[PDB]
C-alpha cells in the first residue's frame, strides 16, 4: 500500500515519480537520500526505509533506487511484487535500465505508470498487454486483460509452430573450509520459448517422482523436486488434483516450471585450494581441480575463481590446463578453462610476493567460487515425457528443448 | 530396423549371461528425441522379440529387464518405463498398453520365479489397466 512509487538516481535525484494515493507529500523523497546515507555509514540501511510515520521502501535498481513511499501498514510483499513487476516491464520495454532511458521515454513512461496501478492497487502487469495498449512510437484496452486468459493473447498467427525449451540446471554447493559441503541444492528451471499460431494449451509431462508413483511406474529414474512452482498460465487446480500441468503457453519466452530440491550427489567439480602464504614474503596457490562429472560431459567456460591476496603483486602462475589471469579489480585469480571435460585433473601453482609493510586491517577470506557450465548434462536425471500441445484449429507442433547444466552457488569456503 | 536386429543378438546374449536371480552423471545424446514407448511401438518390439527369440520363456529378472530397457532406449529412444510388469502375486501383465510381453510364474512375490511370456491379447486387452484403474489414471 505504497503512497507513491518513484524512481530515484545515483545522486539522489528522482528520475520519475508518480503518486497513487496522495497521502504522502512528494517532498519526503529528498529526506530519503540522507536517511540512506546515514544507514549505510552505520550499517542500519535497509530496503524498506522509515521517514517518521511514512515508510519509504526502496529497491536497488541498475542505476536508480525505486523508492516506493508508503504511509499506512500496506502490504510490504505486495509493494515488493509491484516494484518487481514495474522493473520487469521497464526492462521489457527499454533494453537499458539507467538514466539514459529514464529521461528519454518520459511520455510513455508516465502513461505506463498511470495504467499499471491506480490508488496504490496494481491493475496491469502483463508486458505484452501493456505494450498492446501503451506504446512509445491509443486504442481501447485489449480484451485479454478483461478475459480470464491474461497470459495467452488470442489471434496470434505464425508461419511455423516452434517452441524452444530450456532445461536450465543450477548446481549450488556450499563447501565449508573443512572440506564438507553444507548447502548442496540444485534448482531446476523449465523455461520454454513458445512461438506458434493461436493460444495452445500446453500439457506439461515429465518423469516426475510423484507422477510415477501415482501411475505405478515408480521404478525408473524420476526427478523428485522438493519445491515446484508453476507459471502464471499453469493451472494450479490440475496440479493439485492429479499433477496435470495444463496451461496456455505464453507468446514468447516464459518460465513454466522451476524445480527446487536438495542434491545428495557428489559435486560436479572438486576444487581443493592450498595457501602456502609466507609471512610477508610470498604466497602459494596450490589449487587442484578434479572433475567429478561424467567424462562424456565437458564443462565449457570453466572459471574457478581463487581469491588472491589483496596487496599481492608480481604473481606467477604455474598450472597445467586452463589459462590463469589475475584481475586487480577482482583481487583474485580465476582458473579460466575454455573446455573442461569430465574427469579432468587440473593442478595450478601460484606464486607471488607481498609488500614488506603489513596491512593495517584484515581483508577476510571470501569463498572460492567456480563458473563451470557443462551443457547437455542432466545431473538430476529428470527427463521430459511429453508436451501436450493442443489447438482448437488443429496443427502439428514441433517443440524443442535443451538441457543446460551450470554452476550456481558453488562456493567453497576458504581455509 | 538393421540396428535393432543387430542389437537383438547382443541384448539376448547379455540377458542370458546374467543370472536369473561406476560412472556418474546423466549424459544425453545431442538432438536424440526422448519419449515413452507407444502402444504400436511396444507391440512391434514385442513381435520382433518373439520372432528373434530370447524374450518369451526367459527367466524374468531385474537385471535382465533393465538391460533390455537400456538396449531399447539406445536403439530407439523409448523410455525404459513401458516394460513394466503388473503387481503380483502371480502373472504380471505389461504396464504399458500394447506390450506383447508379460511376466508369469514359473514354479513372497519377490522370491517367486517369473518368466517373460508372449501375450497377444495384452496388446488388445488392457488387463493391466483393468486390474489397476487407479494406476492408469
Amino acid at each position: 500500500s505504497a503512497s507513491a512509487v518513484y524512481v530515484l538516481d545515483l545522486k539522489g535525484k528522482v528520475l520519475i515519480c508518480r503518486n497513487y494515493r496522495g497521502d504522502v507529500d512528494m517532498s519526503e523523497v529528498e529526506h530519503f537520500m540522507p536517511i540512506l546515507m546515514e544507514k549505510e555509514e552505520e550499517g542500519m540501511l535497509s530496503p524498506i526505509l522509515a521517514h517518521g510515520g511514512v515508510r519509504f521502501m526502496w529497491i536497488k535498481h541498475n542505476n536508480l533506487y525505486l523508492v516506493a513511499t508508503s504511509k499506512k501498514n500496506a502490504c510490504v510483499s505486495l509493494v515488493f511484487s509491484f516494484l518487481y513487476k514495474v522493473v520487469q516491464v521497464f526492462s521489457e520495454y527499454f533494453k537499458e535500465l539507467e538514466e539514459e532511458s529514464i529521461r528519454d521515454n518520459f511520455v510513455i513512461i508516465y502513461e505506463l505508470l498511470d495504467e499499471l496501478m491506480d490508488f496504490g492497487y496494481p491493475q496491469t502487469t502483463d508486458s505484452k498487454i501493456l505494450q498492446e495498449y501503451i506504446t512509445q512510437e491509443a486504442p481501447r484496452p485489449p480484451a485479454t486483460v478483461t478475459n480470464a486468459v491474461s497470459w495467452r493473447s488470442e489471434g496470434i498467427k505464425y508461419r511455423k509452430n516452434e517452441v524452444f525449451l530450456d532445461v536450465i540446471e543450477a548446481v549450488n554447493l556450499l563447501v565449508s573450509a573443512n572440506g564438507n559441503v553444507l548447502r548442496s541444492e540444485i534448482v531446476g528451471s523449465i523455461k520454454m520459448r513458445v512461438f506458434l499460431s493461436g493460444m495452445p494449451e500446453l500439457r506439461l509431462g515429465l518423469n516426475d517422482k510423484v507422477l510415477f508413483d501415482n501411475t505405478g511406474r515408480g521404478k525408473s529414474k524420476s526427478v523428485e523436486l522438493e519445491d515446484v512452482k508453476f507459471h502464471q498460465c499453469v493451472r494450479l487446480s490440475r496440479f493439485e488434483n492429479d499433477r496435470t500441468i495444463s496451461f496456455i503457453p505464453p507468446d514468447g519466452e516464459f518460465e513454466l516450471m522451476s524445480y527446487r530440491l536438495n542434491t545428495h550427489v557428489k559435486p560436479l567439480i572438486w576444487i581443493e585450494s592450498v595457501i602456502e602464504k609466507h609471512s610477508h614474503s610470498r604466497i602459494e596457490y596450490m589449487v587442484k581441480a578434479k572433475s567429478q562429472f561424467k567424462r562424456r560431459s565437458t564443462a565449457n567456460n570453466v572459471e574457478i575463481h581463487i581469491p588472491v591476496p589483496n596487496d599481492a603483486d608480481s604473481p606467477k602462475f604455474k598450472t597445467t590446463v586452463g589459462s590463469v589471469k589475475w584481475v586487480p579489480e577482482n583481487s583474485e585469480i580465476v582458473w579460466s578453462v575454455k573446455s573442461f571435460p569430465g574427469g579432468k585433473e587440473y593442478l595450478m601453482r601460484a606464486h607471488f610476493g607481498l609488500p614488506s609493510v603489513e596491512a593495517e586491517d584484515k581483508e577476510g577470506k571470501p569463498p572460492i567460487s567456480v563458473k563451470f557450465e557443462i551443457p547437455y548434462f542432466t545431473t538430476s536425471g529428470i527427463q521430459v515425457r511429453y508436451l501436450k500441445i493442443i489447438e482448437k484449429s488443429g496443427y502439428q507442433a514441433l517443440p524443442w528443448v535443451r538441457y543446460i547444466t551450470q554452476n550456481g552457488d558453488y562456493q567453497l569456503r576458504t581455509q | 530396423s538393421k540396428s535393432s536386429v543387430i542389437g537383438w543378438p547382443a541384448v539376448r546374449e547379455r540377458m542370458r549371461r546374467a543370472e536369473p536371480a561406476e560412472e556418474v552423471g546423466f549424459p544425453v545424446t545431442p538432438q536424440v528425441p526422448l519419449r515413452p514407448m507407444t502402444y504400436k511401438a511396444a507391440v512391434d518390439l514385442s513381435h520382433f522379440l518373439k520372432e528373434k527369440g530370447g524374450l518369451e520363456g526367459l527367466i524374468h529378472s531385474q537385471r535382465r529387464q533393465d538391460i533390455l530397457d537400456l538396449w531399447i532406449y539406445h536403439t530407439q529412444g523409448y523410455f525404459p518405463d513401458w516394460q513394466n510388469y503388473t503387481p503380483g502375486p502371480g502373472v504380471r501383465y505389461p504396464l504399458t498398453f500394447g506390450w506383447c510381453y508379460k511376466l508369469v510364474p514359473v514354479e513372497d512375490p519377490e522370491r517367486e520365479v517369473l518368466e517373460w511370456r508372449f501375450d497377444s491379447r495384452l496388446a488388445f486387452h488392457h488387463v493391466a489397466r483393468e486390474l489397476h484403474p487407479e494406476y492408469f489414471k
Binding site: 547437455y376 517443440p399 | 518405463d81 489414471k137
Partner: peptide
C-alpha cells in the same frame, strides 16, 4: 549448434501410460 546443449524434439505425452 548451440552452447548449453543442443535442442531436442519433445513428445506429446507418455505413450506407455495409456
Amino acid at each position: 549448434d548451440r552452447k548449453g546443449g543442443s535442442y531436442s524434439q519433445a513428445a506429446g505425452s507418455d505413450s506407455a501410460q495409456s
